[model samples]
Target chain A: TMIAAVVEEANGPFVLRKLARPQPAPGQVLVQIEASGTNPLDAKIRAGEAPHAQQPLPAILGMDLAGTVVAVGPEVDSFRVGDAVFGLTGGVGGLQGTHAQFAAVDARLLASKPAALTMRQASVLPLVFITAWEGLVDRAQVQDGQTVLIQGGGGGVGHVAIQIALARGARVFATARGSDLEYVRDLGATPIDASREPEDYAAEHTAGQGFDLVYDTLGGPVLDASFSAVKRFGHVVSCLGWGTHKLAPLSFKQATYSGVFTLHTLLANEGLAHFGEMLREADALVQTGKLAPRLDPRTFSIAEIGSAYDAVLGRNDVPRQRGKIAITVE
Target chain B: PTMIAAVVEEANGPFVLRKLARPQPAPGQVLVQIEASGTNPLDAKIRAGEAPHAQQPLPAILGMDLAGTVVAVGPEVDSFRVGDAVFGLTGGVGGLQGTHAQFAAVDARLLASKPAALTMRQASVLPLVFITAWEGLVDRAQVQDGQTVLIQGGGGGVGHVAIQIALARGARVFATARGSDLEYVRDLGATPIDASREPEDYAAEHTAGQGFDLVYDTLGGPVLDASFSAVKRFGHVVSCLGWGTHKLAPLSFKQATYSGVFTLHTLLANEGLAHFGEMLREADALVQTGKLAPRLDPRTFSIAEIGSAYDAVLGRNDVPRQRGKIAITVE
Candidate 1:
């Protein structure tokens, strides 16, 4: 038996209940979850508005998990019982979530957890890390000495993007909003106040030539700015590229743009191994002290999952700490 | 001191014949005595103030393509000298003196020796369309030798040039044209797709729903939207007329890309002219090799009948033909 946080309906409070623990199927692993981290997406799933991330009613509601492998099903040789693992494994599109004491996850999605990061830290890093890596490394092919501009450089995906670009040996710059200038600078990026015009910064930092790559974390108008902020024949990648846009600015520069939908794997059941591979890379970087996730210092348990979602959504002034709102599930 | 030229004195005004001072060459400039000028739809748009990105201000002489003799050379002009025949997209927009004159003091970097095998009128037609096609195909898309390239408007001005250029680059070229032009495009060595038909069916037929490696959108708005849905993963789409807002879902979903070809930027910004000259030299080489040809309407318009020329392009002057582009002849 295991205790799980289950949301009985849309916008319902998470109820802690005892249930039969999930068993590993073939090519899967049963993880004894030590920590589950909440994301804004998790709150969106709970409120039933994230149609793209559909976790049918009465579903557990966490996608980012850090746990220990207690059993490995047939054909799973990569990880064994007693191995620490982490992944953005489930909690959407009818899959069982990580907000539980145990989960039977596809083995291909699990990577040995980074030894350097605690479960609380490792739990909150997967989704955002994969998102940044997929856009910067996978889509745009960011290379050494290339100039990369992250639009929301202090937020979840943006913060990770700054580090990844730095790690790739690129000249990293970021638009740090009013309060986060020194913070992103501490992350090894040249910080520009978002209040400045993108062109002004592009000129000031890159000599009137645009950055070789621009990651649009804020989306919408910022994506538009990113379009104009990229160099000729350069690249722009975005996670929130679902809006109508005047493509003239991007097309005029002969630049390339790519959209990152990390949920594509969860939605299509394809490309699972690549996500696992990215997490493995993440583990290496974290151990080298070159990577980490910023987290809210507060901790809440399965019994307080409602407050966790509230804090992520900023409901009733329970503000998320700079986009890193993590819930501790034990 | 003056010569006959057409000028639009105000926005949306008709072209008027005027006697303006013959331009003198300046430092690093060549005074090309005009012989033939190519008329592009962009001229019409600038005249009507309908082209948002193209600004001519007012009282602008509007012709971008010119084939002419270098009547004189200015200080530091190393590329061209007196009596050399040259052709280029030399002017028309951006408040610069344009090609619609007896002589133009053109920046030396914009001029290239005309293709030895083609006439003045033919060379005039090659500059604008060829530049548009070359930038999108060679510079931006970098189309591979065996990759499939789709030209969205096969019978339009830049469309045929794009097909020829891609074919010259050894691509398996396809084009979307309507009716009998399909056969025309096929004769140009490409499989012709009917633009009136569903793009999905064509994409599936040619590429099995995987989409083309490159789509050149000569037509904008919904057609540009259509181009977005018809590219393979990591494939590219290029357009000269991408001035509208669009839903990016189709492009984003495929992980494909799009590039805009603003040829005027080469002329107006007055930068990248050397690249344009090099491309023009390439066009000349292609012409010499029989890989490039300008499709001119059988009937030509003289300088005295410039309005008739605009009517011919507007498709309302009872002037009809199978030719995809039109040119003006000077005598």
Candidate 2:
């Protein structure tokens, strides 16, 4: 028998219940989860409002997990029992998610976790890190010696993008809230005060020429600003690019923009193996001290799962700096 | 020496013929005695003060395209000597001399040898429309052989030349025109489409729900919106008129690309002039080989009738049969 948190209904409370432990099918691994990461999208999924995430209800609701592999299925040579594994296995598509004590995941999605970090640290990185990597590296093809401007530097995808840009030898700039300006400055990026207008910062930073790349972590008008904030022939990337925007500012300069719908791999079932590869890169960066997720000090257990979700939606004046909320399941 | 030229002295004023001192060729310049000057909508735009991008001050001469014989060359101007027949998108904007005069002192860098097969009038209409279409088709979208190309405009100045160039490149070219212009485009070896047909129906009928590989939007605003929806995923759309605000959802969602074709930047900025010279030679070769020719309006106007030429262009004094591009001859 095993325990899992399921959303029995949309906008309903997290229901903790017992189910028969799932066995590994072919090309699958059974992970004994020790920690589960909560994202803003997960909260939206819980509220039954995140049709965009495509995570339907009456299902388990976590996107990332860090734990140990206790059993391996047939036709799998990639993992063994007692291997420390972490990945963004599911919770969005019809596939089973990682919010349970035992999850049978496609072996192609699992990568060995970095030994230097705690399970809590590994749990929080999978979704946010992949979002950053796909936008900065996959879509934009962010080059070395280029100037990168991150729209929300201290948020979930933003902080991770800052480090990824730096690792790729870029001069990184980020728009941070007044509270986070110092933290972003310490991350070795020159910070743009988010309190001021985006154009003021855009001009103050790039001297009106615009950055080589603008990553719009903040959607809507931020995405609109991103169009004008790009250099002539530059590129802009966004995951939240599902809104309406005027293109003259972009097309006038002969620039380009690409949308990064991160869940396309998981939702569309096309490229599950690439998730594993990105996590391996994350593990390498972590071990070398180039990347580390700032963990939220407040913790939860499976019994306190409902409270954990509340804190995920806590809407504190300081959210990210309080670190990401995690369920320390054992 | 005094030579008669057409000049617009103020905004919305009529073009008047006057005797101005013949411009002398400065160093690196040439004196071309004007033969035929192409009259495009841009000439009227500058006279109306509507095309601020043209930047031609009032009390100035107005004409852009010209085919004439070089009467003299300045010091260090080795590209041409006296009696070298030349044509170019030289000067109708800026403080430089325009082509409405008997002779223009234009930079030697701007001249290209006019094709022996094309007359002064035929060569006059090629520079502006050819540069507009070629930049969008060849330079920006880079339409390759076997790629499907779509252009939205009638079969006259820009649209006809685009069809000929795409045919020369061996593309399955498509163009949209309404009314009698449809048959005119069909005669040019392209798949002529009705301008009233929406992009979806055409895509279904021609490309099997996939889009044209390249959509050259010569018409701005609404047609540009259609151009965004008319390109295949990862395809490209280029326009000479991309200066307005538009919804980008259709374009960005498909991950397609767009580039603005602003060739006057060469005439205004005085750089990138070499590419125009090269493109002109390519244009000349096409006409010489029977691969291309520009359609001209049957009615010709003398330099004394410059205001009437503007009226014929504004399409009110123009008859529907005279809808082809107008030209002013300085014989």
Candidate 3:
């Protein structure tokens, strides 16, 4: 038996319940979770806003986990008992999520937790790291010496993407609020005030030619700005790209846009191995000190899961945390 | 000193036949005596004076594609000699003189040897549509063997050419056309889909509901809207006419990609002329291998009958509507 944090209903409190411990199926691992990371989407899933996530009520609600593999199922050779691993394991698509003491996670999603980072930091990196990887590396094919603009550079995906672009030898620029200006600069990116017009920054940074790639970590008008922010034949990628938009800005330049819906591969039950492959890459970056989590100074436990989510959501009159927030769940 | 040409004096104006000064072949240019002038739907837009993007002001001659014989070659040009038969998408936009004339001095890099198997009229119609289709299917989508490709509005000029190009690249091709044109699409070696049906229905039937690996939207608006739904997750959707606003949620939810194809940049910008001729050479090769062919309207008219040709192309109902691409012979 194990204790799990369950969302019994939409917009409801995290209900603690003693649940049966899950047994690992074939190609699965029984992970004894030590930490669960919270993101803005987790709050959305809890509010029943993300239909695409396929995570319904009465479900555990964390998308990222860092833990030790306590048992390995048949055909699983990636991790053995007592090996520390981390992944964006679930809290989506009706799979058992990581807000519990133990989860039967797909072995393909797990990667060795780098010795350089703590469990809380490792837990925070998966979903955002994979999101950044799929957008900057996989979709945009970010190249060396290319100009890259990341919209929302202080946020989870934004900060991670800046590092990845820098690691790839790209001339990376980022937009952030006045408060996060220094935060973005510290990430080895040229900082632009978020309030600046896309055209102004584009002209100033690219000599009016436009960046070779633009990432819309902040969607809506940000995604719209990303259109006119790309050069002719450039690319724009967005993880939150669900909106009606006038395509003239993008089409006129013959630029391209690719959506980075990370859950599609998991929900569709295909391409699961790529998730593991990405985490392995993330582990190497962590080892080299090129990638690290900018986590919130405060920590929470499973019992304080509601407060952690609030910190991420800035709800209940709680001020939003500046960096990623996590719940220690051991 | 002069040659006969048809010029539109104003918007919604008549085609006035007049003698225009023969153009001289400048450096890197070739003077060609045009034999056939092909008309496109865009020519109608240019004639209506609605194509501000075309940059063809009033009192302009109005053909974009032409097949001709080189009568003179400039000093810097080496690709063509006197008496060489050639075809190109040379002008009618960007202030360049149009091809509805007896002679034109075109950039030598834009001209390609006319395929031996095709008639001059057929060759005249190949350049614009072939380039538009190639830029979308080959350059943007990178469609390859064993992938599923769906071409929307497959009976149109760019559509038919796109189907053949995707087929030539070894993709498993499906094309949507009206019931009346299904046979034509099938005869072109692509599986024909009924245009009236929902995109998801055919996507399910063909790709087991995974959607096509790529979709080329030849028709804009609602057809481009449907292409967003008919593509596979992480697949590509390319459209030549993507000027309208669209709800990107359908495509974004699938985590797919969309690229707009605008083929006129080379002609408008006066750059990339070498690749322009390179694509025409590809069209020539495809024609030689019998892998591609152009369909033209059976009825032909002289350059002097420009008004009647415009009527057919614009579907004015005053003349027999065009059965295929219209060709106006330049005598």
Candidate 4:
């Protein structure tokens, strides 16, 4: 069979090219991709800006995909052909990214797509949703009736963090610009304006105490603030751990902290099934109307990959217009 | 009813002899006529106006450890009365307050009947430091047999007690102290390393780059920073003195873990007092078996000499530098 893919040629533009497709290897499944989500990181990798992204040029450019499984390789047991699936498949380190008509993905990274949504909706989920779930639930163990404050709640990972916190029955608070207040509140979070002032919303909502868990999607000073915003003996998990942190505030409260590196599994080949399992759980939540992704309005076919990358990187002067970009691949 | 007490009129002031009203026990409370009160560095800090957590407002009764006889029981309190000897880390930080006074209205959950064969002075020294050490190492870190544990400041208040607790659990123990305190730690069944010695020496001699299963930081700041380098991957490090700001890159890089112990939460939060009593019972058993003993200094102070007691603790000079504790008696 042949597949049409949006391949980057010399870090310039993504050019559509037809290539021969191989059959799925053992423990692999061939997915007929319907949609591929575009993220800020996708733009970074397309521009050769991500140092850790070592994939050579003339390679595919998406990390997440939603599709129907068309074939399964030998020894693949959990999923069969004709199953709906979504996953973080590729884009970094070559290995056939999802901005393609078909992807021969590792079967362990595939999950049945939620029955309630279109491929576009399911496509925008895998990366940000999994990152949020790993930080909020897996690492922090955020529980019902506990409070959680999501740093940068309007970003790709942050928005998902807010929803995951709400789904887990937590009292969710999120830090965003004043304009993103209603946007976050509509997602069932009490919004704190990070642009306005240095407010410890966790302490205010918790009576000068603090939230039981703080999910730092935005690293740097925001992550440092998370340390002070967690309750005594509480926990904090950060998906972004780029900056140095003085951990005394957390230590004095007898609290603990964890740093989440989502790419470790994909790069190190560990916990791959757990990532798929998270997507399945997320799919269930979407079907139950407990979760949704805020996707950007500008759409691109696999041929318009550059426009998709540009949309993800463009500054939004209009507050409500800021959206998550994704590309369609048929 | 009257009782003798060492009452501090002001910060850095004398402990005057006073006849105070003997407090009657309330429901779920026991009235202890104290035989001995153990002085901790916190008592000295309270006397010097330094311990904000101690809440030692004027006319404060400044003691944290008590071993005495239960003289009165309130309504619904049937556990002990009229001379059941008991010991506890009953008070001093909040206004339910310390054992420096001759009588204390202690919650029954905070009191344990003193173990037989240990003196009142010995029992008095066991509560605050022992509970703090046990809660940090055992309850928090779950130090187990065959695991190697590194105790920082292993000759001081909580460090000494932590060494014994770890040894009793059958864990291999190592401790860091000044050259002067090495022998004292070695005598307590821990492999001693002079902390003044280089990290490379200790790392080579005992743990190598593969660190201890548990690193307990009794002294915070730089010692805790050192502990970050001395703990293995997935190992747990616990600290009671986690007061200073620190960069956690060393711990985060190894994917190791850390826990901080705040012993005052039970008294301040009004939950988990029964667990405190339960831990004291375990400590009492350890004492009863002669597996743990209080290394008390010979210096004694009366209620009237409380200022001198505070000075002795603050200076850390009156006793042999290696002595376990100094205490005061009130009659």
Candidate 5:
């Protein structure tokens, strides 16, 4: 038997219940989960806002996890019992989530956890780091000596994107609201006031040309502004590219825009191996001290996962939360 | 300082034959005595004063593509001497003099020496369409060998050239055309698809439901929307006519890419003229090697028959529809 936090309905309260322990199928491994990461997307899934994520009601709700492999299933050879690992294993697309004491996850999605990071820090890295890497490295081909602008530089994906761009030798600039500018600058990126016009800052920085690439973590009008702030023949990538906008602003400059949907692999039940590949690369960066997740000072236990969701959604009446909220499962 | 030119006095106006003073070549410019002026759909739009984006106001001479001989060289110009044949998509828009006149002072960097394999009429129609194709297929998408490419509207100006360019890059090409144009597309060494069928049917047949690696939407609107689903995951979709709003859900969900190809950025922005010369030089290599050629509409019109020429362009019922692009000869 295993204890798991389960949401019975959309926006329902999390209830801890004893359930039959999951068995690892072929190409799967049973993970003894230590930490579960909470993202705004998790809250969206709970509230039934993201239909594209494909998680129906009465589902467990966690996507990112760090844990130890308790058993390896048939056909799985990359991991063994007692192997420490992390991954974006489940919680959406009707797959069992990581908000439990144990989860049988596909072995292809597991990667060795960095030795230096705590389980709390490691749990938050998979979703944001993979999303950022897919956009900057895989799609836009962020090169050395290029100028990159990260919209919403203090947010989860934005902050990680700054480090990734910096590690790749790009001259990184980020848009931060007020005091967060300092956090961005301290993180080795030039800070732009989020309220300032994208064109004005783009012109001031690039002599009226624009950045070579713009990564829009904040969608909608920010993405529209990204269209205006990109150089001729530049690239723009957005994780939240769900809205409709005029293409003329981008098309007139002959530029390109690529959408970054990291959940496709989870929802489509394919490309599982790339998850392990990206997490291993993330581990390398973490070992070099060039990549790490910034966690909120306050942590939560599995019983207080609702409070974690509240905090992630800014509904906890807190003026500021430093970084991502994480829930301890073990 | 005198020359013969065709001027449009108003929107949907008649072409008025008039005498204007010949323009002197500015520094970095050369005067071309035009032999042929190619007419595009954009030329018809500009004649009706409909394309504000082109920036060519009314009462302007209007042709975007020209082939001719250099008559004079301005200061700081050395690529072309007075006797060399040249072709370029020089000024018809952006408040600059166009190629409809007998003589135009064009930026020297915009012209390449006409290829020996092509006549002046054949060369005139290639500059704009070839550059439009090259910018999308080569510059933006970087179409690789062994990739599947789909050109929407394969019989149109940009579409035909894009097919050849994709084929030249060793890409397997598929083009969508209607009725008899399918034969034309097939003759160009591309597998022709009927435009009426859903993108899924053909993608399933050809790519085993994986979709093409690259899709060029030469015809925009609904065709552009179809292009989103016609490309594979992480594939690229490019279009020259992406001036409308589109739902990004199909493309974003597949994690694919879309790039717009606006060929007139150099003319409108007054920069990047050198790349135009470079593209045409590349076009010359393909033309000379028999890898590329222009398919011009057989019925020709001289400068005196400019109205009849535009009737063919605008598809007036009185005039026979053009099977290919139209070109007007200059006396």
Candidate 6:
């Protein structure tokens, strides 16, 4: 028996209990998890708040995991026991999750973790990195000398967005609090305090011309602001399109807008293999020191899952941290 | 012999009443006696230095669309004659002089015989808006019959023209407009939806959140964002106003595609002028058939009152009810 945090009821506390380890199905790999990353979405899923989420109750909570492959199912050929792996494997809308000692994961979602980073650092990457990549590189086709504005650049997706834009040789501007101004700038982005010059930065940085691409990780008014900040014949990409919006502003400028729904392929079982491919590219970046995960300083152990959730919820204010809290598994 | 002209000497300057040397028709060109010239928002933008694309050098003649009778034809210009009524989007950008003057030496290919049924003021307004709409919907989007097209703004200059063209092609159109413009757009045969209404309301009403087959974004910015949500997967979006930097995530997720329309490429690049002429000919056919008509604002202006004409075209609050268009008539 192994210990795992499970939620038995909606809006209830996580109960740690001894549970039987899951066996790998065909084309699956059993990963002995070393670390797991916690996003705010994971907490929402744990409370059964995500109606679209299919993750069963009493299931574990974590979107990404870093570990070693303990066993491979019969149909899996590329991976074997003792292979170090990391991925955005299971969490919301899946049967098993990364918040456990062992997870029976699809072999398609596993990639050989980069050798330069610890399991803890690798765990913090998959979800946010893939999201940023899908938005900037895959969707926007950000190229050298192109200007990219990352809304909420200090958040989980925004921090990675800055680094990814830098990797592609694009100039990046990120919106953040005055406190995270230095942190985002250190990642090679020109940081603008969203709180202070919310109205002027877009016109100022772009010389009243507007940016080449604006990636809105934070939706609502920021996303609305992105439309005004784009250059004529330019594009605006967003992942957070939860609210209704007026398109006249974007329409009159003759710009285009794209929405990213990253969870679709994962939940629908389509393009699952690309998840592993995306991780391999991310691992190369991490190994080369071109990309790094900005982990929140408030770390938690597997047993301190409750504290991890609180830290991610912003209930415990911490000084000098970047993004999503991570929990280390031993 | 000289011709009457309305010329501007400086940016944001007034049009001066002047007598300029009348241009003689060159080879493959025709000299046209200007009857009417269409005034657009771009005319005001050019005068104010607001439009970088429209660089009118000092002592410039300004007019984009014109209709008149050909006064003379140069050697090798066989298609028109002295009595031919012709219209075209001719000179403002080429610096070959403009139609605001009594006569202009216009390239034969850019000139089309004006539709027999339409008046000169009506013919003058068709070239710019018709070509822009045709290039976007027919050439770029390849809008087909039975396909659902969403024109983001239905009452604006391009939007109004685009709605008519899409309807003539048999494409089902849904136009986004203020509540007040619904009846006006519905009169144009488009299914009008209030763009100010919630996205969910439209999502539930028309597409069930699935989106349209084609989206023509004339507004830009958030309207483009709404278009992204309103387009069906793999739908095509074309825009003449694609001027700002935008994230393409919404389009990428649905595997939708986007194309930008630069209508001035013919005038700037100089390769597509013949095609512009072809579009004008087709537009003339539509005009003759009564399938198309210019929304001429009843307000008239003389060449000397060009500044007030510019103000009327550029004013914001009056845009919705600006009947037809403002035209400069040279008698």
lDDT minimum window of 10 residues, candidate 5 chain A: A314-323
Off by over 4 Å in 6: A1-330, B316-321
**Shift of residue B316 alpha carbon in model 3, Å:** 1.0
Candidate 5's chain A scores what TM-score? 0.98
Clashes of 3: 0
Task: Tell the DockQ for candidate 6.
Answer: 0.01
* Native contacts conserved, per model: 0.00, 0.00, 0.00, 0.00, 0.00, 0.00
How well is each residue in B1-331 modelled by candidate 3, as lDDT tens digits?
6788888878979888876557778777899999999998888899899997786767678899999899999877888999999999998886567888999988888999999998999999889999999999999989999999999988888999999999999999999998767999999999999999998799889899999999999999989999998999999999999999999998779999999998887775445778989999999999889999887888888988877887887778578666668888995
Worst 10 residues of 6 chain B by lDDT: B315-324
Tens-digit lDDT track for model 6 on B1-331?
A: 5778888777878788777557767577888899988877777777665666764444567888899999899888788978999888886752335567888878788889999988888788888888888999999988899998889888777787888888888888889987766887888888999878765578568877778889988888877777777788999988888888887898899899999887876764345678988998888777777677777778877877777777677765354345546778775
Query: Weakest 10 consecutive residues, lDDT, candidate 3 chain B?
Result: B264-273
Runs in model 5 deviating more than 4 A are A1-330
Candidate 4 lDDT, A1-330, residue by residue in tens: 565665555567676776888589999998999999877777677666776666666677788999988998999997877898888988776667788889888988988888887787789888899899988888988899998888888888999899988998999988886435656977899888775333445556778788889888888888888887888899989987877889788779999999887777777778888988998889878878889887754456787666566556642211122446667787
In candidate 3, what are the lDDT values of residues A288-326, reduced to their tens digit? 989978776556779988878777876653435667887
Give the per-residue lDDT digits (tens) of candidate 5, residues B1-331.
5788898878989888877657777677888999999888898898899987886766778899999999899888889899999999997886566778898888888999999988888899999999999999999999999999999999999999999999999999999999979999999999999999999999999999999999999999999999998999999999999999999998889999999999986776455789999999999999888999887988888999988987887679588777778889994
The local distance difference test score of each candidate is 0.84, 0.84, 0.89, 0.80, 0.89, 0.80
**How does candidate 1 fare on TM-score?**
0.50
On TM-score, the stronger of 1 and 3 is: 3
Give residue A31's lDDT in candidate 5 (0 to 100).
Answer: 96
lDDT of 1 by residue, A276-302 (tens): 999998888888889978765455677
Q: Could you give candidate 2's per-residue lDDT for residues A1-330 as a string of tens digits? A: 899988888778778889889999999999999999878787788888987778778888888899999999999999999999999988897767777898998999999999998898899999889999999999999999999999998888888899889888999999876545655776789988765675677788878788999999989988988887899999999978989888998879899999988798989989999999999999888888888785655556777666676656643211122346678778
What's the residue-level lDDT of A307 in candidate 2? 62
Q: Which tens-of-lDDT digit does each residue in A1-330 have in candidate 5?
A: 899998888889988989999999999999999999888887788888879889887888899999999999999999989999999998989988888999999999999999998898899989999999999999999999999999999999999999999999999999987536756877899998888998799888988899999999999999999999999999999999999999997779999999999999999988889999999998988899888687764557889888777767756332234568778999
Q: What is the C-alpha RMSD of each candidate to the true structure, in Å?
A: 23.8, 24.4, 24.0, 23.6, 23.8, 24.9
Worst 10 residues of 2 chain A by lDDT: A314-323
Docking class of 5: incorrect
